[PDB]
Design a protein around this nucleic acid. Structure first.
Lengths: 261, 261
DNA sequence: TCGCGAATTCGCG
DNA sequence: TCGCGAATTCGCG
C-alpha cells in the first residue's frame, strides 16, 4: 500500500491482532504519516462526557444520569486528534461482533436443538445491542460533520454469499445467505440508512423532505460473508481509510499545526 | 379525564390489558373523538416499506435487503391515520420491555449466582436491543416532524427510587436505584438525547452547532421506578396523549377531512 | 467494590 | 415453512 501502510498491514497479519490492537496500530500509523499532529487512544468514554457534549448543542440535552460512573466501552476503542483549539476530536471508533456458530457445529458432528437433531440453530437477536453504542457516539459527535464508526461482523448469521459445509460423515449442508433463519444482517441496516455495506460512510450526508435540512450519521458496516474469520491486514486498511477521511473533514481545524510547526 | 378518556381508562384497568391491547383501545378512542378521520392498527411493518420511505428522501437510502421477508414487530403495534392525500401517517408506536427479577427472588428465599448465595443478580444488557426498532421507526418517519415512539420499562433494573424488599426470613434487602449493579436506565438515555424521562417527547426538536440545522427524533421513555407492574389505565393515558400530539403536528394534512365531511 | 459486555437457546404464529 | 422476539447468567478488570 501507500508508504508504510503496507508494512503495518503485514505486521497485523503476522500477529492476528484483535480489533482493539489494530486501532492502536492505526493511531501509530497516523502519528507516522502526520508527525505534526498529536493522536491518542482510549478504551472508553464516560456518560458524563457525552452529556457535556450534548449540553453544548442544546441546554435541554444530556440532562439524565442515574448511575454517576456510567460509560461505554467499544472493544475496538477510540482514536482522537487534537485540533488547533486544543480540543480532542474523534477520528475512529471500532467494534467487532460475532453471532452464529453453525459453521463450527457442522464441521463437527454436532446436532443442535432441544431434541439434538437440527443441523442449524435458529438465529438469535443479541446483535441488535450494537445500535446502543452507535447512538451514544452519534450524540457525542452531533456537532461533527463526520461519523467514523466501524462495525465488523462475522459468523453464520452474517452471510452475503452461499456456502457449503462438510461434516465428518460426508454430507454437505448447503447454507443460503438469503435465509431468514440465519441471516441477521437486516438487524443492522438501520444504522446506515440502508446505504451500501462494506463501504466508508464517514462523511455525513445532508438530506431534507421539505425546507428543513437534516444530518445523517451512517455507520460503516463491514461483514465477512464467507463465514471465515476477519483478516487483520484488511481490518487495518479499512480502519486507516476511515481515519484519514475523518482528518479530511477536520482539515480546517488542523491547518495551524501542519503549517506552524 | 376529558370526556370518554376516563371511561376507556377504567376499562383497561379492569382487564389489565397488555401494551398491544391498549394500543387498540387508543385507536378506538381516537376514532370516537375524531369521527371524521380514519384510523387503523397494525402489528408489524416490513423492511420493504421502510426502504421505500427512505428512497423517497434520498435515492441512495434504503438500498439493502438481504432477507426479502424481513420485518419489525413492536409488541405494542402501530396506530395510523389517513391524511388528506390518502396516505397513512403513523400516530403511535408502543413497546414494553422487562428486565431484572430481583424483587421476585427476594420476595422468595431464592439466592442466585453461580454459587447460590447472592441476593442480587448482576444486571444484563439485553435491553439495549430496544435501540434497533427505535432506529427503524426513525428512518420510516424521517420525513415527519414528530416521533411518537413510546417505551415502557419495568423490573429491578429500572429503578428511580430506593426500595426495600422483605424475604420469608424477615431480613430486608435495601436496593439503591443509583447502583450500577442493577440500574440499566442509562442504556436507553441515548434514545432521547438525555431529555427528561417519563415525558411526551413527540414533537421533534431542531438544533444546530454551526449554520447546519439538524432534526432530533427523541423517544418517550417511561419507567416504573417502584419495581411494580405497570397500570394499564395510566399506560392508556400516556399513549393517548402522545397520539393526540401526533395529530397536532399532522394538523395541516387533516383539515380537509375535519371540514369537508 | 462496581459497571459494561458476551451472544446465547428456543418459544411463538 | 420462515422470521422476529424474549431477556437471560455470568465473566472480566
Amino acid at each position: 500500500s501507500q508508504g508504510v501502510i503496507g508494512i503495518f498491514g503485514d505486521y497485523a497479519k503476522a500477529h492476528d491482532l484483535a480489533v482493539g490492537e489494530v486501532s492502536k496500530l492505526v493511531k501509530k500509523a497516523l502519528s507516522n504519516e502526520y508527525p505534526q499532529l498529536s493522536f491518542r487512544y482510549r478504551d472508553s468514554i464516560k456518560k458524563t462526557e457525552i452529556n457535556e457534549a450534548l449540553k453544548k448543542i442544546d441546554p435541554d440535552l444530556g440532562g439524565t444520569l442515574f448511575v454517576s460512573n456510567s460509560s461505554i466501552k467499544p472493544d475496538g476503542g477510540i482514536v482522537e486528534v487534537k485540533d488547533d483549539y486544543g480540543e480532542w476530536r474523534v477520528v475512529l471508533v471500532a467494534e467487532a461482533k460475532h453471532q452464529g456458530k453453525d459453521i463450527i457445529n457442522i464441521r463437527n458432528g454436532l446436532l443442535v436443538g432441544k431434541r439434538g437433531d437440527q443441523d442449524l440453530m435458529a438465529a438469535g437477536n443479541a446483535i441488535e445491542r450494537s445500535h446502543k453504542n452507535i447512538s451514544e457516539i452519534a450524540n457525542f459527535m452531533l456537532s461533527e460533520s463526520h461519523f467514523p464508526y466501524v462495525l465488523f461482523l462475522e459468523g453464520s448469521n452474517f452471510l452475503t454469499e452461499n456456502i457449503s459445509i462438510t461434516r465428518p460423515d460426508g454430507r454437505v449442508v448447503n447454507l443460503e445467505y438469503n435465509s431468514g433463519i440465519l441471516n441477521r444482517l437486516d438487524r443492522l441496516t438501520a444504522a446506515n440508512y440502508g446505504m451500501p455495506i462494506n463501504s466508508n460512510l464517514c462523511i455525513n450526508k445532508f438530506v431534507n423532505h421539505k425546507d428543513k435540512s437534516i444530518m445523517l450519521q451512517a455507520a460503516s458496516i463491514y461483514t465477512q460473508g464467507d463465514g471465515r474469520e476477519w483478516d487483520s491486514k484488511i481490518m487495518f486498511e479499512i480502519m486507516f481509510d476511515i481515519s484519514t477521511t475523518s482528518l479530511r473533514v477536520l482539515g480546517r481545524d488542523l491547518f495551524e499545526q501542519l503549517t506552524s510547526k
